[PDB]
Coordinates of all heavy atoms in Angstrom, one line a residue:
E121 N -36.2 -11.2 8.7 CA -36.7 -12.6 8.8 C -35.8 -13.5 7.9 O -35.3 -14.4 8.2 CB -38.1 -12.8 8.5 CG -38.6 -14.2 8.5 CD -39.7 -14.5 9.6 OE1 -39.6 -13.9 10.6 OE2 -40.5 -15.3 9.2
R122 N -35.6 -13.0 6.7 CA -34.8 -13.7 5.8 C -33.5 -13.9 6.3 O -32.9 -15.0 6.2 CB -34.7 -12.9 4.5 CG -34.5 -13.6 3.2 CD -34.4 -12.7 2.0 NE -35.6 -12.0 1.6 CZ -35.9 -10.7 1.7 NH1 -35.1 -9.7 2.0 NH2 -37.1 -10.3 1.3
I123 N -32.8 -13.0 6.8 CA -31.4 -13.1 7.5 C -31.5 -14.2 8.4 O -30.6 -15.0 8.6 CB -31.0 -11.8 8.2 CG1 -30.6 -10.6 7.3 CG2 -29.9 -12.0 9.2 CD1 -29.1 -10.6 6.8
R124 N -32.5 -14.3 9.3 CA -32.6 -15.3 10.3 C -32.7 -16.7 9.8 O -32.2 -17.6 10.4 CB -33.8 -14.9 11.3 CG -33.5 -13.7 12.1 CD -34.3 -13.6 13.3 NE -35.7 -13.6 12.8 CZ -36.4 -12.5 12.6 NH1 -36.0 -11.3 12.9 NH2 -37.7 -12.5 12.2
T125 N -33.1 -16.8 8.6 CA -33.2 -18.2 8.0 C -31.9 -18.7 7.4 O -31.8 -19.8 6.9 CB -34.4 -18.3 7.0 OG1 -34.1 -17.5 5.9 CG2 -35.7 -17.9 7.7
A126 N -31.0 -17.7 7.1 CA -29.9 -18.0 6.4 C -29.1 -19.1 7.0 O -28.7 -19.0 8.2 CB -29.0 -16.9 6.1
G127 N -28.7 -20.2 6.3 CA -28.0 -21.4 6.8 C -26.6 -21.5 6.4 O -25.9 -22.4 6.8
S128 N -26.1 -20.6 5.5 CA -24.8 -20.6 5.0 C -24.3 -19.3 4.9 O -25.0 -18.3 4.9 CB -24.7 -21.2 3.5 OG -25.5 -20.5 2.6
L129 N -23.0 -19.0 4.7 CA -22.4 -17.8 4.5 C -22.9 -17.1 3.2 O -23.2 -15.9 3.2 CB -20.9 -17.9 4.4 CG -20.2 -16.6 4.3 CD1 -20.4 -15.7 5.5 CD2 -18.7 -16.9 4.1
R130 N -23.1 -17.9 2.1 CA -23.7 -17.4 0.9 C -25.1 -16.8 1.1 O -25.3 -15.7 0.8 CB -23.7 -18.6 -0.1 CG -24.6 -18.3 -1.3 CD -24.3 -17.1 -2.2 NE -22.9 -17.0 -2.5 CZ -22.3 -15.9 -2.7 NH1 -23.0 -14.8 -2.6 NH2 -21.1 -15.9 -3.1
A131 N -25.9 -17.6 1.8 CA -27.2 -17.1 2.1 C -27.2 -15.8 2.9 O -27.9 -14.9 2.7 CB -28.1 -18.2 2.8
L132 N -26.4 -15.9 3.9 CA -26.3 -14.7 4.9 C -25.9 -13.5 4.2 O -26.5 -12.4 4.3 CB -25.2 -15.1 6.0 CG -25.2 -14.0 7.0 CD1 -26.4 -13.8 7.8 CD2 -24.0 -14.4 8.0
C133 N -24.9 -13.5 3.3 CA -24.5 -12.4 2.7 C -25.5 -11.9 1.5 O -25.6 -10.7 1.3 CB -23.0 -12.6 2.1 SG -21.8 -12.7 3.4

Side-chain angles (χ1 to χ4, degrees):
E121 179 118 320
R122 204 182 294 116
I123 285 272
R124 285 199 305 262
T125 69
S128 64
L129 183 62
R130 163 59 48 206
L132 179 66
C133 294

